[PDB]
Amino acid sequence: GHNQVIHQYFDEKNTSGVLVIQTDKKINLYGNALSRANTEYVPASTFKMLNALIGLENQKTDINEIFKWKGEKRSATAWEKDMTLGEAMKLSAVPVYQELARRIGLDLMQKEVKRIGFGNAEIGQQVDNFWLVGPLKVTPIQEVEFVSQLAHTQLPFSEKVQANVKNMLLLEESNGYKIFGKTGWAADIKPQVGWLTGWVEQPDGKIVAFALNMEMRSEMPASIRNELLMKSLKQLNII
Numbered sequence: 001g002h003n004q005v006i007h008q009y010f011d012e013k014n015t016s017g018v019l020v021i022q023t024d025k026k027i028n029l030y031g032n033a034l035s036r037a038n039t040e041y042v043p044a045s046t047f048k049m050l051n052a053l054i055g056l057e058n059q060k061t062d063i064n065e066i067f068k069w070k071g072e073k074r075s076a077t078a079w080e081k082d083m084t085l086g087e088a089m090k091l092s093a094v095p096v097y098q099e100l101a102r103r104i105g106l107d108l109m110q111k112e113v114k115r116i117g118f119g120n121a122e123i124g125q126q127v128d129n130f131w132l133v134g135p136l137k138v139t140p141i142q143e144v145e146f147v148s149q150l151a152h153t154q155l156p157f158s159e160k161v162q163a164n165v166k167n168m169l170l171l172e173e174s175n176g177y178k179i180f181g182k183t184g185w186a187a188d189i190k191p192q193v194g195w196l197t198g199w200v201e202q203p204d205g206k207i208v209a210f211a212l213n214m215e216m217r218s219e220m221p222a223s224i225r226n227e228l229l230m231k232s233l234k235q236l237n238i239i
């Protein structure tokens with residue numbers, strides 16, 4: 001696991017990005033734009049995690065509620081179905097989480113966000129878009145620390161709420177490993193920012209968190225972040 005082979009994976013996708021890795025409060029940067037690790041970006045679909053936690057803890061919803069699709073045209077055609085808060089996490093279904101956000105309410109949402117101390121902790125005034133176009137911005141280091149506390153069940157929420165949000169985030173379960181995470185893509189700011197923040201539950205239960213953050217372009221496949229990460233964690237010998 002050399003910090004150079006990982007520069008070339010990023011050199012080669014013609015992007016600019018950083019991979020933050022945390023292993024029990026020790027943090028390392030990999031990639032080819034390590035200055036991104038201290039830069040504030042909008043969270044995007046990654047804030048869904050803190051939204052779910054805030055919504056469940058405050059009983060504005062539950063893991064069994066079905067969100068009804070009331071007919072309107074949506075940005076992706078898989079989002080056009082009734083679905084649970086968990087299935088909306090998998091699909092990054094923004095309408096579901098905007099409905100949750102409006103139940104929470106601006107006052108409650110600002111209070112929770114400030115208490116947790118997520119990013120700049122600014123949510124401004126539109127309770128249903130602040131993670132997508134600001135004013136909320138967070139750095140990739142701050143992200144990997146949040147997602148680290150969530151894997152270790154050390155966030156300021158009930159034990160059962162964190163477990164619930166954790167179970168919404170499984171991505172690949174091969175070789176006795178488990179990779180949890182949540183993708184993101186702010187395709188509406190210049191330049192576009194792509195996220196991938198999660199952790200690896202190694203077979204012995206040791207927990208290694210990651211926040212991949214890269215500038216995006218409209219032609220890249222969704223699975224470019226998956227591809228970059230899965231092959232980076234292979235290099236550092238985490239899988």
Ligand SMILES: *C(=O)[C@H]([C@@H](C)O)[C@H]1C[C@@H](SCC/N=C/N)C(C(=O)O)=N1
Nearest residue numbers: 044045046092094183184185187218
């Ligand atoms: C979440 O962050 C995305 C956004 C609508 O909030 C949703 C949708 C895709 S992004 C597709 C747009 N650009 C594609 N070239 C997505 C994701 O997988 O990141 N989540």
